[PDB]
Protein backbone atom coordinates (compact mmCIF):
# COMPACT_ATOMS: atom_id res chain seq x y z
CA UNK A 1 0.00 0.00 0.00
CA UNK A 2 0.95 3.34 -0.81
CA UNK A 3 0.22 6.86 1.19
CA UNK A 4 -0.29 9.91 -1.13
CA UNK A 5 -0.61 13.84 0.20
CA UNK A 6 -3.38 14.47 -2.16
CA UNK A 7 -4.33 18.41 -0.44
CA UNK A 8 -3.22 20.75 2.01
CA UNK A 9 -4.32 23.86 3.01
CA UNK A 10 -3.25 26.33 5.64
CA UNK A 11 -4.98 27.39 8.73
CA UNK A 12 -4.44 29.62 11.50
CA UNK A 13 -3.53 26.98 14.29
CA UNK A 14 -2.72 23.92 11.60
CA UNK A 15 -3.30 22.59 8.41
CA UNK A 16 -5.90 20.40 6.69
CA UNK A 17 -4.51 17.35 5.27
CA UNK A 18 -5.94 14.58 2.95
CA UNK A 19 -3.99 11.48 2.70
CA UNK A 20 -5.02 8.48 -0.14
CA UNK A 21 -3.71 4.89 1.13
CA UNK A 22 -4.01 2.71 -2.23
CA UNK A 23 -3.06 -0.53 -2.89
CA UNK A 24 -3.82 -2.56 -5.88
CA UNK A 25 -7.84 -1.90 -6.49
CA UNK A 26 -8.61 0.66 -3.44
CA UNK A 27 -8.02 4.61 -2.83
CA UNK A 28 -8.79 5.20 0.56
CA UNK A 29 -8.97 8.73 1.33
CA UNK A 30 -8.37 9.86 4.88
CA UNK A 31 -9.36 13.72 5.60
CA UNK A 32 -7.37 15.44 8.47
CA UNK A 33 -9.08 18.57 9.52
CA UNK A 34 -6.77 19.92 11.20
CA UNK A 35 -3.15 18.83 12.36
CA UNK A 36 -0.90 20.88 14.70
CA UNK A 37 1.94 23.27 13.08
CA UNK A 38 4.66 21.31 14.79
CA UNK A 39 3.63 18.56 12.88
CA UNK A 40 3.67 19.77 9.77
CA UNK A 41 6.64 21.92 9.58
CA UNK A 42 9.18 19.19 10.92
CA UNK A 43 8.20 16.71 8.58
CA UNK A 44 6.72 14.71 11.27
CA UNK A 45 4.46 11.97 9.35
CA UNK A 46 4.89 9.32 11.44
CA UNK A 47 2.50 11.45 14.12
CA UNK A 48 -0.04 12.21 11.14
CA UNK A 49 -2.40 9.22 12.09
CA UNK A 50 -2.35 10.24 15.77
CA UNK A 51 -5.19 12.66 15.05
CA UNK A 52 -7.97 13.10 14.48
CA UNK A 53 -9.57 12.21 10.59
CA UNK A 54 -12.81 11.71 8.91
CA UNK A 55 -13.83 8.07 7.86
CA UNK A 56 -12.21 7.23 4.95
CA UNK A 57 -13.86 7.44 1.63
CA UNK A 58 -13.34 4.23 -0.24
CA UNK A 59 -13.66 4.43 -4.23
CA UNK A 60 -11.62 2.25 -6.79
CA UNK A 61 -8.34 3.00 -7.29
CA UNK A 62 -7.02 5.44 -9.85
CA UNK A 63 -4.81 4.61 -12.72
CA UNK A 64 -2.66 7.53 -11.88
CA UNK A 65 -1.56 9.53 -9.37
CA UNK A 66 0.37 12.83 -10.37
CA UNK A 67 -1.95 15.81 -9.32
CA UNK A 68 -5.03 16.69 -7.62
CA UNK A 69 -8.18 18.01 -9.33
CA UNK A 70 -7.16 21.34 -8.28
CA UNK A 71 -3.42 20.75 -9.85
CA UNK A 72 -1.43 20.47 -7.11
CA UNK A 73 1.66 18.23 -7.41
CA UNK A 74 0.94 14.86 -5.50
CA UNK A 75 3.75 13.46 -3.10
CA UNK A 76 4.20 9.99 -1.25
CA UNK A 77 3.87 10.37 2.71
CA UNK A 78 7.33 9.55 3.23
CA UNK A 79 8.21 12.40 1.30
CA UNK A 80 7.29 14.67 3.93
CA UNK A 81 4.50 18.09 4.16
CA UNK A 82 7.65 19.90 3.58
CA UNK A 83 8.03 18.40 0.03
CA UNK A 84 3.82 18.66 -0.62
CA UNK A 85 4.51 22.74 0.83
CA UNK A 86 7.71 23.49 -1.37
CA UNK A 87 5.96 22.06 -4.64
CA UNK A 88 2.32 23.76 -4.73
CA UNK A 89 2.91 27.08 -1.92
CA UNK A 90 2.53 29.61 -5.17
CA UNK A 91 -0.81 27.46 -6.38
CA UNK A 92 -2.05 26.89 -3.20
CA UNK A 93 -1.81 30.97 -2.52
CA UNK A 94 -4.26 31.39 -5.79
CA UNK A 95 -6.73 28.67 -4.47
CA UNK A 96 -6.77 30.32 -0.90
CA UNK A 97 -4.98 27.36 0.98
CA UNK A 98 -1.50 29.26 1.43
CA UNK B 1 -38.11 36.08 -10.49
CA UNK B 2 -38.52 38.41 -13.60
CA UNK B 3 -35.36 36.80 -14.85
CA UNK B 4 -37.36 33.39 -14.60
CA UNK B 5 -40.03 34.76 -15.92
CA UNK B 6 -38.22 36.52 -19.23
CA UNK B 7 -36.57 33.16 -19.24
CA UNK B 8 -39.86 30.75 -19.23
CA UNK B 9 -41.29 32.54 -22.32
CA UNK B 10 -38.42 32.43 -24.42
CA UNK B 11 -37.84 28.56 -23.96
CA UNK B 12 -42.10 27.88 -24.01
CA UNK B 13 -43.62 26.43 -22.03
CA UNK B 14 -42.97 22.81 -23.02
CA UNK B 15 -39.51 22.92 -22.17
CA UNK B 16 -40.11 25.05 -19.04
CA UNK B 17 -42.36 21.98 -17.83
CA UNK B 18 -39.56 19.81 -17.49
CA UNK B 19 -36.57 22.47 -16.50
CA UNK B 20 -37.96 24.67 -14.17
CA UNK B 21 -36.60 23.31 -11.35
CA UNK B 22 -32.90 23.55 -12.40
CA UNK B 23 -33.89 26.16 -14.30
CA UNK B 24 -34.40 27.86 -10.44
CA UNK B 25 -31.44 26.57 -9.31
CA UNK B 26 -29.41 28.29 -11.99
CA UNK B 27 -30.87 31.36 -11.33
CA UNK B 28 -30.28 31.30 -7.38
CA UNK B 29 -26.54 29.95 -8.35
CA UNK B 30 -25.95 33.34 -10.27
CA UNK B 31 -25.48 30.62 -13.51
CA UNK B 32 -22.33 28.63 -11.61
CA UNK B 33 -22.09 25.31 -10.64
CA UNK B 34 -21.40 25.38 -6.83
CA UNK B 35 -18.94 22.53 -7.01
CA UNK B 36 -16.55 23.73 -9.73
CA UNK B 37 -17.27 27.00 -9.73
CA UNK B 38 -17.42 26.79 -13.55
CA UNK B 39 -20.25 29.13 -15.48
CA UNK B 40 -23.05 27.14 -16.61
CA UNK B 41 -24.32 29.06 -19.82
CA UNK B 42 -27.53 29.07 -19.75
CA UNK B 43 -28.35 28.24 -23.22
CA UNK B 44 -26.50 25.04 -22.58
CA UNK B 45 -28.79 24.17 -19.86
CA UNK B 46 -31.53 24.75 -21.97
CA UNK B 47 -30.25 22.42 -24.94
CA UNK B 48 -28.36 19.85 -22.73
CA UNK B 49 -30.61 19.49 -19.85
CA UNK B 50 -28.70 16.40 -18.94
CA UNK B 51 -25.14 17.92 -18.64
CA UNK B 52 -26.17 19.37 -15.60
CA UNK B 53 -27.83 17.66 -12.43
CA UNK B 54 -29.80 18.29 -8.99
CA UNK B 55 -27.38 17.11 -6.46
CA UNK B 56 -28.72 16.68 -2.65
CA UNK B 57 -25.75 18.78 -0.86
CA UNK B 58 -26.25 16.16 2.36
CA UNK B 59 -27.49 12.68 1.30
CA UNK B 60 -31.02 12.45 2.02
CA UNK B 61 -29.78 9.41 3.86
CA UNK B 62 -28.28 11.21 6.82
CA UNK B 63 -30.15 14.26 5.98
CA UNK B 64 -34.23 13.01 5.39
CA UNK B 65 -33.99 16.75 3.51
CA UNK B 66 -35.93 16.32 -0.04
CA UNK B 67 -36.49 20.42 -0.01
CA UNK B 68 -34.51 23.28 -1.90
CA UNK B 69 -32.68 23.66 1.20
CA UNK B 70 -30.78 20.86 -0.15
CA UNK B 71 -30.68 20.98 -3.62
CA UNK B 72 -27.93 22.71 -5.89
CA UNK B 73 -27.23 22.60 -9.70
CA UNK B 74 -24.04 21.19 -10.71
CA UNK B 75 -22.53 19.16 -13.73
CA UNK B 76 -22.66 15.74 -14.28
CA UNK B 77 -18.84 14.52 -13.20
CA UNK B 78 -18.86 16.91 -9.86
CA UNK B 79 -22.22 15.49 -9.31
CA UNK B 80 -20.59 11.48 -9.89
CA UNK B 81 -17.22 12.61 -8.05
CA UNK B 82 -19.12 13.42 -4.75
CA UNK B 83 -20.56 10.74 -4.07
CA UNK B 84 -22.35 10.51 -0.98
CA UNK B 85 -19.72 12.82 1.25
CA UNK B 86 -20.63 16.77 1.69
CA UNK B 87 -18.96 19.07 -0.11
CA UNK B 88 -16.53 19.51 2.37
CA UNK B 89 -15.42 15.69 2.81
CA UNK B 90 -15.58 16.62 -1.55
CA UNK B 91 -13.53 19.54 -1.97
CA UNK B 92 -10.91 18.32 0.90
CA UNK B 93 -10.12 15.25 -1.63
CA UNK B 94 -8.13 15.01 -4.95
CA UNK B 95 -10.92 14.58 -7.00
CA UNK B 96 -12.06 18.54 -6.61
CA UNK B 97 -11.26 21.11 -9.33
CA UNK B 98 -11.69 23.65 -6.53
CA UNK B 99 -10.37 24.10 -3.02
CA UNK B 100 -12.54 24.36 0.10
CA UNK B 101 -11.27 27.67 1.12
CA UNK B 102 -12.84 29.33 -2.20
CA UNK B 103 -15.80 27.29 -2.11
CA UNK B 104 -16.24 28.35 1.50
CA UNK B 105 -15.58 32.16 0.45
CA UNK B 106 -18.20 32.12 -2.29
CA UNK B 107 -20.91 30.43 -0.17
CA UNK B 108 -20.50 33.10 2.25
CA UNK B 109 -20.79 35.76 -0.12
CA UNK B 110 -23.86 34.02 -1.94
CA UNK B 111 -25.82 34.09 1.50
CA UNK B 112 -24.35 36.95 3.48
CA UNK B 113 -23.80 39.47 0.99
CA UNK B 114 -26.18 38.43 -2.11
CA UNK B 115 -28.90 36.92 -0.14
CA UNK B 116 -29.27 34.22 -2.87
CA UNK B 117 -28.87 30.95 -0.18
CA UNK B 118 -31.27 30.54 2.77
CA UNK B 119 -29.15 29.84 6.08
CA UNK B 120 -30.20 26.72 5.73
CA UNK B 121 -28.09 25.85 2.27
CA UNK B 122 -25.31 27.95 3.36
CA UNK B 123 -25.08 25.58 6.52
CA UNK B 124 -25.83 22.39 4.46
CA UNK B 125 -22.85 23.35 2.15
CA UNK B 126 -20.37 24.31 4.66
CA UNK B 127 -21.08 21.10 6.94
CA UNK B 128 -17.73 20.33 8.01
CA UNK B 129 -18.33 17.32 10.27
CA UNK B 130 -18.05 13.45 8.93
CA UNK B 131 -21.38 12.46 8.60
CA UNK B 132 -20.81 8.72 8.67
CA UNK B 133 -20.17 9.12 13.07
CA UNK B 134 -22.92 8.32 14.55
CA UNK B 135 -23.23 11.32 16.41
CA UNK B 136 -23.08 13.71 13.50
CA UNK B 137 -26.61 11.59 12.08
CA UNK B 138 -27.50 11.73 15.66
CA UNK B 139 -27.63 15.40 15.55
CA UNK B 140 -28.98 15.47 11.91
CA UNK B 141 -32.26 13.80 13.14
CA UNK B 142 -32.54 15.13 16.33
CA UNK B 143 -32.40 18.92 14.66
CA UNK B 144 -35.63 17.86 13.14
NI1 LIG C 1 4.25 5.88 1.68
NI1 LIG D 1 -9.95 9.43 14.83
NI1 LIG E 1 -2.81 14.10 -13.92
NI1 LIG F 1 -34.18 17.96 -17.03
NI1 LIG G 1 -39.64 23.63 -8.92
NI1 LIG H 1 -30.56 31.68 -23.62
NI1 LIG I 1 -26.65 7.02 0.87
NI1 LIG J 1 -36.08 12.50 2.13
NI1 LIG K 1 -32.42 27.97 -0.89
NI1 LIG L 1 -26.61 33.17 6.33
NI1 LIG M 1 -18.75 10.61 19.98
Given amino acids: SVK ?5 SKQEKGYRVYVNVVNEDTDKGFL ?10 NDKIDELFNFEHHKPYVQKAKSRYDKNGIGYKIVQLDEGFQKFIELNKEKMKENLDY | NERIEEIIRTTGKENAKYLIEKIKLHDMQEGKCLYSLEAIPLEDLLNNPFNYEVDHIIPRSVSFDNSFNNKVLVKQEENSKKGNRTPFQYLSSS ?12 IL ?9 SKTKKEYLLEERDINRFSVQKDFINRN
Fill in chain 1, 32 to 41: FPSVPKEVIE
Fill in chain 1, 4 to 8: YISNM
Fill in chain 2, 95 to 106: DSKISYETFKKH
Fill in chain 2, 109 to 117: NLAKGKGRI
